Design a binder for these strands. Structure first.
Lengths: 95, 94, 79, 108, 96, 79, 108, 94
DNA sequence: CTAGGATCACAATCCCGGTGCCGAGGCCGCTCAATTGGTCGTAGACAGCTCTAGCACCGCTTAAACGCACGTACGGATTCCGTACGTGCGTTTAAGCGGTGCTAGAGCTGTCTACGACCAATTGAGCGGCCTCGGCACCGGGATTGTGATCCTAG
DNA sequence: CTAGGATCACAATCCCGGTGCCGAGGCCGCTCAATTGGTCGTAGACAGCTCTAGCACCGCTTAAACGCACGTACGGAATCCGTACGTGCGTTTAAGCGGTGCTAGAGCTGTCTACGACCAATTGAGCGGCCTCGGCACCGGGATTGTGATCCTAG
């Protein structure tokens, strides 16, 4: 048995839209945060709740952007999101 | 150690008024505290601006009412103003 | 190269919560770049707040404030 | 002997702390003076809004056969009401997730 | 006689209006609209001349910005004609 | 019938400043609707300010404030 | 006989009014107390920003063979500098117009 | 007769310093006044928030500096801080 | 005979010169708000201490990520059609400008009173700490929904 | 022999009862912030007056809107190709969790001093008002740029 392209993609959409857990691995995200912060000030420490707040904000932002990217794609009569859709979304959003 | 004030007690009282058999998680209580603080700031800040624009030094119930009308959308404002007015009336008659 | 820690399947999960059905292969690098920019901005404001308080530990309140001033208010972490 | 202490909240028939709201207004660098009615009005408005959102969240919880409100229920309540969505437009509810929404063009 | 090809005059107008700064909406109709709209909120309302001018400036800036974003949307759908679905998309993404 | 005062050639001029080359026939009604919504919002808030001051004349400062609180700060009219 | 009045602007080598800035800070409901250096710092920053904008606008005027700065020149100066554009992103300059920009795809 | 204070004199002085032969229209002067007022209330408001967050009652040069760093983008903040620091130094030595 | 560059007719836009008018830049009187000199007190700087919570490391256990492969379906290029939008001309309309008249209401001043700040004594409401137990997450295993294709028939 | 529907296989989800754990809600002690009662000063409500600017109307000019005719180029539908993203099985890896240990620095407290508010005096800088002149807007003529198309040419 092989599901046709799209069936599993819709099942995943339903599953992740029903759940609320964070989708980025914590340890890699923490490393990224620390690496970025290193350029501003050295020997910075971070509260666990600081990293969690950052992760939450980043995930929310990215989900919203993917939504607007999806609307752009649908408007160009596509079903596939492309870099040009992210760029357009961001430009219109003012970013 | 030491006190960090919060609106937990009052949120729980209101929840027990509206849903006697419904509880609340700590994370939802934190959300409700953040919400109450945010709205407080928004209202107080717009009342402050209103007062300053009109070269007045006192924030009265009028400033609060106007801020509510400016901030709360649609029927929310309608009902919020009603609630506030009733409370003030009750307060003024002790 | 810690930016590479944001894997292909993580980005796909994020897109799936956003309702995206099909994803081009070039989206992953674009997303990584966008995330990097966002993070840099927020962290730069949080560190500014930390430095003003003469602290060496970034607190959750620094982050909350940074988000607030960027118009991305976050609820659940003390404000 | 003086009179028994009667809280300003009880005089106004409110759950929210009028005295605390007054103090926060006076010490929040908003104005030089604060009227006597301002804390009462503000407290009443904040109590009404929290009652509304708690009621909607409790309804969502009950619909989900749950007895405790979680961030999910708060997000559902807020995003499903046009007015509360408009008030809380630029607000992110931690651990709230999103509303189930799939574009009609993507369905099989 | 001489007829300019479709597009020539449209580009000439783009250049002319993008170089000038005068207001493009007729003053008297805009004033009437403003007063009509304000009538629904409070009666017997007067208006300072500078109030109407401020409103007209804000509205024209807003509309120009929206037409710009509508144009970008059209160009992204491989069109050169702006359509209601471009305005709608722009506004939705803007958050309006 | 004053919304019709925003004529077809006015909308075309606005689009031309925005760099639009070709305009569909259905754009005019959409634009009129958008403008109406915007105007209603701004005027509503300006009138609220006027009423709070117990005045009968909408001032340019009421408008400026209304625009400011909607994130559309206007320069040139006293703030 | 006391000493000749020396303005705090002249003491700081500033053109902006330090005394006025101080008064506006004290009466603007910002904080309980205002340090002595705060008005000086603020005035200096304001002066620098004004100088920058004015310089760029004067350059645009001189490029347009004009002797007087108009809103157009200010708009040109602000929108042609990435940093000033970012600072004044959500600001509308009355009678400023827009920057000449035509999409490449529309050209003949 | 009602006196309305403005920054016109100071905006003109600076213009005459940077462009001795360049004048300015009334509408540009109004634009520059609005600008100066807006940036003033952005900086002061940020300094106020900073002070409040740290449970301070005084707005000092440190708060202003931080507020400048937070508000002004990129090199603008680098030069503005320099300018402010120089002024304070000059002021402190009378 | 064509595709291509060259040459042409024409309208539109940039440029130079003269006129004039009204807004900008300067001078003057004065008045009020900023400066000088001094006092009082409390807010913040600085030093010291505590203990909490952040950082670093290690060992298993999977869950998830990486890689490769087969294939279908979605992006994209090409072609054709018809209609909808751009361009231009003659007619109509109402916007823009000036001038006059009027009065409502914005803006300011003076008086006085009620209301909000401030202080001292009192106390009860709200916060920290402890504890218990039931709402929830998790698990196994059936019932159910759904996708895909194999089978059967009338046509 | 084909299209459509009937039927089947069986993977993913949902539902149910049982387990047990750790977080939410309640109770107790205390302490400090809210209340009560009284004093005092000044901010704003109210009344009255002035004079400005917002509204209403009229006539005249002409620029802009409008309606219609015509044509063309652009949006949209259809067809075909091909590549590249999706679904899935196998191997690898490092995230997650639990535990242990160290120590840096965040939070709090005590003491002191200096920096800012407040007051009185005084004086000069900035604002309203008046006035003049020159910089820019406009009109006219001309040089130039550019579009649309007719022509001559090399091939």
């Amino acid at each position: 048995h092989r599901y046709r392209p799209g069936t599993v993609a819709l099942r995943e959409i339903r599953r992740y839209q029903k759940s609320t857990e964070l989708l980025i691995r914590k340890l890699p995200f923490q490393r990224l945060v620390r690496e970025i912060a290193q350029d501003f000030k050295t020997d910075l420490r971070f509260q666990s709740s600081a990293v969690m707040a950052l992760q939450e904000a980043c995930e929310a932002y990215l989900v919203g952007l993917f939504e607007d990217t999806n609307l752009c794609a649908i408007h160009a009569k596509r079903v596939t999101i492309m870099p040009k859709d992210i760029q357009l979304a961001r430009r219109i959003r003012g970013e | 150690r030491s006190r960090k004030e919060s609106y937990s007690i009052y949120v729980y009282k209101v929840l027990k008024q509206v849903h006697p058999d419904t509880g609340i998680s700590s994370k939802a209580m934190g959300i409700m505290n953040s919400f109450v603080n945010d709205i407080f700031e928004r209202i107080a800040g717009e009342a402050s601006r209103l007062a300053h624009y009109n070269k007045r030094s006192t924030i009265t119930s009028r400033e609060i009412q106007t801020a509510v009308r400016l901030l709360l959308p649609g029927e929310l404002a309608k009902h919020a103003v009603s609630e506030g007015t009733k409370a003030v009336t009750k307060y003024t008659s002790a | 190269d810690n930016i590479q820690g944001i894997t292909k399947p993580a980005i796909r999960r994020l897109a799936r919560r956003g309702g995206v059905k099909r994803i081009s292969g070039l989206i992953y690098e674009e997303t990584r770049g966008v995330l990097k920019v966002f993070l840099e901005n927020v962290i730069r404001d949080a560190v500014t707040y930390t430095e003003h308080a003469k602290r060496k530990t970034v607190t959750a309140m620094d982050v909350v404030y940074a988000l607030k001033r960027q118009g991305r208010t976050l609820y659940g972490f003390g404000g | 002997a003086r009179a028994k202490a009667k809280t300003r909240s009880s005089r106004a028939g409110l759950q929210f702390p009028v005295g605390r709201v007054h103090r926060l207004l006076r010490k929040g660098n908003y104005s030089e003076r604060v009227g006597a009615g301002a804390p009462v009005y503000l407290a009443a408005v904040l109590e009404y809004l929290t009652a509304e959102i708690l009621e909607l969240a409790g309804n969502a919880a009950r619909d989900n056969k749950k007895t405790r409100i979680i961030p999910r229920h708060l997000q559902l309540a807020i995003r499903n009401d046009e007015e509360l969505n408009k008030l809380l437009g630029r607000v992110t509810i931690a651990q709230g997730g999103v509303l189930p929404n799939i574009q009609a063009v993507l369905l099989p």
